[PDB]
Every structure is written in structure tokens, then in C-alpha cells.
Structure 1
Amino acid sequence: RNAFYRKLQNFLYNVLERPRGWAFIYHAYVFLLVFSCLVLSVFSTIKEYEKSSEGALYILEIVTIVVFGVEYFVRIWAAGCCCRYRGWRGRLKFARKPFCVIDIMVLIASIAVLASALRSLRFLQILRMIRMDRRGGTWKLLGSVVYAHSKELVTAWYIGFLCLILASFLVYLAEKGENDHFDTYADALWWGLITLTTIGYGDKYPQTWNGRLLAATFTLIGVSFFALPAGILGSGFALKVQEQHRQKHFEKRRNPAAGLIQSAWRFYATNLSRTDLHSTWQYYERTVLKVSIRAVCVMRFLVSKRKFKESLRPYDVMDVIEQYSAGHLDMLSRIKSLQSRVDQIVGRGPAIT
């Protein structure tokens, strides 16, 4: 009634916020719904299928709006579990985040429309689509990758832009009068962009032969340089996600490390024969036979050591390098101690002799 309700609130906060596995399945289903709504709107734009598309889209839009309303209700209801956002005042405070601001803006726009509208509806659809993330993870990753590879990307942009401008200008000179496509330098720039991107619509293409030679040379260079950024971004994406996985693995290390320290200290302060361990003993007592407490504490220490060793997996060359290099320094200290002790032995040697 009370604990069960709080547990359900936490579970619905889990699903409504940062879903995992099945929660992600629910989010995928709601995304499916909204995407089907968008596709049916696009179909309703067409005149031929307007009637059937509208007939099948009215009900889907009603379903989408009711789902959005209940989802927002549950979101604000479950925002109260967090201590930072505890209480109704804390729930209201939670709405000041940029994404809550975006969601409320979309909600006010949608209710205003519900209470020339096709353009506004399309903009609202785009905004609600942008609302699907709620974490900024995609944009954060994109920005981090761009900033990390800023040098390569800027080099590609600079060289490709120079190539585009120069090629467009030279082909414009080659074909200003002969070809109707290139009657202006802006047309030549449009052609150069469409060519170096390899889109090649075909609306504009060189027809003179000096123009075709210039186009060939500069299209080789420029298609290479325009394809550069995509590969740079792909490599950056891979690297950044790998770094994020490494950091997550190290945090998963950090937690069991604290667990192991806790359980080891508990065992040290739970020795049956020992004394002056009142804190841990009384601790177990309040949590609640001394031998049983010692046995359970030893068992906890063993399982915690198992967990810590499990988390100590390499995951990387540098990881094991550092792990074993700590021991290498330990061994260097040990061998220095052995050297000092042999020095003691040799100093004492004259005493015996």
C-alpha cells in the first residue's frame, strides 16, 4: 500500500526515464506510434490518398495525444521520488530543465492548435520528434566527436571549400558562354556543390571539353575531400563510444572496490577471539549468535573479493599494464628492502668473523 506504491513509482520512473531493455521496448513502441502518425500525415498531404489517410490518421492522432497526456502525467507524478525533486514543489522545480521546457512548449503549442495550420502541425511534429531523446546523448556524442577531431574536420572543410570555390570558378569560366547551365557564378557554385558531394542531380553538368577536364581534375580532388568528413566522424564516433565504455567499466570497478573495503573492515572488526570491536558487533546486533555473525561476515568478505576480482578484468592493454606495474613497483620496493637487508648482513659479517 505504501512501500508497494513507492516501488511502483520508482519502476515507472525507471521506464519513463532513461529506459533499459524492456523500458526501451515501450519507448520504441511509442516512437513507432508517433512515427506512424507522421507517415500518415505525410500521406494525408497527398491529394489522391487524402481521404483514407485522414480517416485512418484521426484515430491514431487521438491515441497519440492521449498517450502523450498520460505519459506527462506519470512523468510529473514520478518526478517526486528523487530527493532533489521531492515534494510537489520539487516536482515543479524539475520542470525548469531545458528538455522539460521544450516539452511544455510543445504541449502549449499543441493545445493552442487543438483549441494554414498544416505548417504549424508539421513544425510541431518535428519538435515532438526532437523530443524523443530526452538525454541529449546523440547531440552530446556528435559535439564531442566534432570537437575531438576539430583539426581533421577543419582541414577537410578548408581544403574542400577551396576546391569547391576554385573548381566552380574555373568551370564557370570554361562554360560561361557555351553552356546554359553555368550562365552565372552562383549556378557554377551549385553545380560544384552537387558534384563534389557526388549527388550529381544532372541538372547542371559541363559540356565543353576544357570545362570537362577541369571538372574531372577537381571532382577527383573534391569528392575525396568531401567524403573525408564522413569517415572522420565515423572513426570519432567509434572512439568516443569506446572511451565511454571504458569509463563505465572503471566505475563498475569502483563500486565493488568500496564493497570489498567495507566487508574486509567488517571482518577485521568481527573476529570472535578479538575484542574492542563493539561498533561492528553492535552494528550486526542492530541489523538483527556471535559465531553466526562472524561466519556471515567472512562469507560476505569472500563474495565481495570474488566480485572485486570479477570487476578487475583487463578490458584493455593499458589497464593490465597499470595493474601489474603497481605490483612491479611493489616488487622494486621489495628488492630494495632485500638489498638493504643484505647490506645489514654484510655489515654484521665482520662481527661474526
Structure 2
Amino acid sequence: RNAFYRKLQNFLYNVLERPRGWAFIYHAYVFLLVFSCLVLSVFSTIKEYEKSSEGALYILEIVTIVVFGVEYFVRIWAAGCCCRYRGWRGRLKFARKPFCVIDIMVLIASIAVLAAGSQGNVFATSALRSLRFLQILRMIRMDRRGGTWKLLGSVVYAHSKELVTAWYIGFLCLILASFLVYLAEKGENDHFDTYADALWWGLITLTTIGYGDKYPQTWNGRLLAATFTLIGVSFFALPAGILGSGFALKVQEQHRQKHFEKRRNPAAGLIQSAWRFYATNLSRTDLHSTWQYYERTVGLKVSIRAVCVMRFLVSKRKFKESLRPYDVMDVIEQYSAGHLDMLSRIKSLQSRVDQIVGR
């Protein structure tokens, strides 16, 4: 069943590499399993629940090594589906991907720690640390693309000036308020023994964590703390609000722009122009016969080649400016072109009717 085999392999590749829709379910399950393991590892640290947590953790470690090995082999097969990695050499080339090699390294580490535990020589602390680190490593691997980091960095850089303003003003407010409260309390309050303690109090207050170990206990200390916290809490909360609003606005703008679509025209122009520019052959029976057709519509050889490259070049630029269309640029440029065109045609109407009057 060649068709069935290809269809199944493509389906598995889509699920394991490009989970557009319901495929995410599977990934979630895997994450859950991994996450569950992590939680068990935490329970393994506690000495009270050592036995049951250790047993469940070993069972889940066996299950997860099995699942990860099966997934890795199936992912090798799926990458085999992709033309970029067709054949044994292509699959090996795919397996050199940094995330794939990281995953296989984690798998080998897990099987190795299990085997060492079977041996018994390996200390329990070593195995626990190893398994915890492998679990977090697969957690990181879940991204597999760096999409979250890239998005966060993009939004942070977009609001770099505003974030820096928030950080700078909040830092100045923290320093000033901590110093003033330190002066107010100093010896009166045991909490504010040293300026380092005052800075710790200020950081824990303006962030609104408010542990309660440190807090002013004098009338002037409390007065200054009130006046300064009323603004410092907002300053320290600013970055979260700025980033959240930026994320929401970016989501809105994307849901508009990527929902525009209506593209691939410059890409089609590129395909045509590359085809014609490759066709500029040495008078062989290939498309250069179509080039003789093209020149028929009209030494001359060079001009033909020239024009082909020209379309190629121009097409390139179009796609380059059409890769990420901007609504404001599109609308402004189209309005300018259209209105200028209509005005020019109207003036042509005036000239033509004037000559008609002359006629």
C-alpha cells in the first residue's frame, strides 16, 4: 500500500513536527507525562514520601523512556517522509538537528541512569539530579523552535524604551524610598538594622510581595512608606502591564494582517521569471525555443537575457516587499497611486475635450 504508507507517514510527520490542530492533544499528553514525572521528582526530594514517590517515579521513568524512544524512531521515519531528508543519508542529516541530538542525548542519559540504578553503585543523589535535569531538558525541548523566546524578545525590544523607563524610574523610587525609610527607622526598628535590610524591604514592598518580616514601625517611617509605595507599586507593576498590552496589540495586528493574505502573486512572478531566466540557454531544444517564441513577438540575444533577468530582479523586490505586507503602507501607497492616476486621467479628459472643441 504505497499510497497508504505515504499518507500515514505524512500524518505522523505532521503530528510530530507541525501540529496545526488536534495533533497538539498528543503533545499535551506527552508534556503532561513529563510534567507528572517532574512533580514526582519533587516528591522524591521529601524524605517523608520517599518510598511511594520513588516507586511511582521509577515506573513513570520506564514509561517515559519507552515513549521517548518510540517517538524518536517515529520522528526519524517522519523526517524521512520530508523530501529534504529522503533516503538514509537524508534521515541521518535530519538526525543532526540540534534538538534531535539533544533529545537522543537525554534518552541515553535516562536509560543510563536507569541501568546504573539497576547496578546499585550509583548514589541516589546522582540519579535524582540526573533525572530532574533530563526532565527539565525535555520540558525545554517541548518548544523545539524557540518560538516563545523569539516572541518575548520581539515584544520586549518593541517596547524597549518604555520598559527601560519603567525600570529606571522604579529603581530610583526604590533606592529613594528605602533610604528614607532607613533614616526614619534605623535604630527605632530592629528590622531596618542596615541599609541592605532597608533595600530588601523596599524591593519586597514595591513588588507587592510583602513578606511581612520587614515593615516600618514608626510614624515617620510609615508615612514615608505610604507616600512612596503608592507610586512605587505602580512603577514596579508597569512592565507586566506594558508587556501584556503589547502582546494583545500584536495579537490584534497579526489577526488582521495574516488574515489579509491575498498574496503569492509576486511569488508567482518569481517562479515565472526564474523559469524564463534559466531558459536563456545556449540555443538548445529546451525553453530557449520558447525564447525564440518570445523574441518572435517583437545580436539581439543579450536583450532577451537582459529583460529576463530584469523581470527576475523586479519580481524579487516585489516578493520582498510583499512578504510582510503592512496595512498602512498598502493603503497609503494605493490611495496615492489611484488618486494621482484618476487626476491625471481627468486632466487628459480636459485636454482631449479642449482639442475636440478645437476640432
Band of TM-score, shorter chain: 0.7 to 0.9
- Give the CA deviation at 1:85: 2.7
Relative to structure 1, the CA distance from residue 305 to residue 204 in structure 2 (aligned partners, 3 Å threshold; closer, same or farther) is: closer
Alpha-carbon offset, residue 313 of structure 1: 16
Check the 8 A contact 1:270/1:294 in 2, yes or no: yes
Of stretches 180-189 and 218-227 in structure 1, the one that deviates more from structure 2 is 180-189
Q: CA deviation at 1:290?
A: 36
Take 1:275 and 1:45, find their aligned partners in 2: how far apart are those partners?
75
How many angstroms apart in 2 are the aligned matches of 1:100 and 1:267?
39
Alpha carbons of structure 1 residues 31 and 194: separation in structure 2 relative to 1, 3 Å: same
Tell whether the 8 Å contact from 1:160 to 1:222 is kept in structure 2 after alignment. yes
Show CA shifts across 1:40-62 (max 9, x none).
33233334433333333333332
Q: 1:267 to 1:179 in 2, by over 3 A?
A: closer
Change (3 A) 1:251 1:93: farther
CA contact (8 A) 2:279 2:287 kept: yes
**Structure 1 residues 303 and 225: CA distance shift in structure 2, 3 A:** closer
Distance 1:254 1:120, change over 3 A: same
Q: Is the 8 A contact 1:259 1:304 kept in 2?
A: yes
More deviation, 187-196/293-302: 293-302
The 3 A distance-change label for structure 1 pair 251 and 96 is: farther
The answer to whether the 8 A contact 2:37-2:135 is kept is no
Query: 2:80, 2:86 within 8 Å by CA — same for their partners in 1?
Result: yes
Question: Which secondary structure does the structure 1 equivalent of 2:282 belong to?
Answer: coil
314-323 or 22-31: which moved more?
A: 314-323
Moved more, 138-147 or 84-93: 84-93
The answer to whether the 8 Å contact 1:252/1:311 transfers is: no
The Cα of 1:8 is off from its aligned counterpart by 1.8
C-alpha change, 1:122 and 1:319, in structure 2 (3 Å) is: same
Give 4+ residue runs of structure 1 displaced > 4 Å after superposition.
255-327
Cα distance per residue 1:55-84 (max 9 Å; x no partner) = 333333322221111111111222123333
Does the C-alpha gap of structure 1 residues 244 and 281 become closer, same or farther in structure 2, counting only changes over 3 Å? same
Q: CA RMSD in A?
A: 8.4
Q: How far does the alpha carbon of each residue in 1:157-178 deviate from its partner, in whole angstroms, 9 at most, with x for none?
A: 1111111122222222222222
Change (3 A) 1:307 1:10: farther
The alpha-carbon distance between structure 1 residues 17 and 125, as it changes in their structure 2 partners (threshold 3 A), is: same
Looking at structure 2, the residues matched to 214 and 158 of structure 1 have their Cα atoms a distance apart, in angstroms, of 20
In 2, are the aligned partners of 1:141 and 1:240 still within 8 Å (CA)? no
Q: 1:329 to 1:33 in 2, by over 3 A?
A: farther
**C-alpha distance in 1 between matches for 2:348 and 2:205:** 72
Change (3 A) 1:32 1:255: farther
**How many residues are aligned here?**
348
Aligned mates of 1:53, 1:182 — CA distance in 2: 43
Write the distance in 2 (CA, Å) between the matches of 1:70 and 1:87.
20
Structure 1 residue 305: deviation in Å?
Answer: 24
In the TM superposition, what is the alpha-carbon distance from 1:274 to its structure 2 partner? Answer: 29
Q: 1:139 to 1:12 in 2, by over 3 A?
A: same
- The alignment-based identity, stated in percent, is 100
Superposition TM-score, scaled by structure 1 size? 0.75
CA 1:120–1:59: 2 relative to 1, 3 Å: closer
Deviation at 1:221, TM superposition (A): 1.9
Distance in structure 2 (CA, Å) of the matches to 1:300 and 1:150: 40
Question: Counterparts of 2:130 and 2:278 in 1: how far apart (Å)?
Answer: 68
The gaps in structure 2 that reach 5 residues or longer are 115-124
Quick check: 314-323 or 63-72, which moved more?
314-323
Query: Which residue of structure 1 aligns with residue 307 of structure 2?
Result: 296
Q: Distance in 1 between matches of 2:68 and 2:322?
A: 41
Identify if the C-alpha distance between structure 1 residues 260 and 77 changes in structure 2 by more than 3 Å, giving closer, same or farther. closer
C-alpha distance in 2 between matches for 1:304 and 1:37: 53
Partner residue of 1:351? Answer: none
| Stretch of structure 1 that moved more, 311-320 or 214-223 | 311-320
Greater Cα offset, 107-116 or 313-322 = 313-322
Select between 21-30 and 225-234 the one with higher mean Cα deviation: 21-30
**Cα 1:174–1:301 shift into 2, 3 Å:** closer
Aligned twin of 1:232: 242
Counterparts in 2 of 1:101 and 1:248: CA distance versus 1, 3 Å? farther
Structure 1 contact 314–320 (Cα < 8 Å) conserved:
no
Deviates more, 1:165-174 or 1:304-313: 304-313
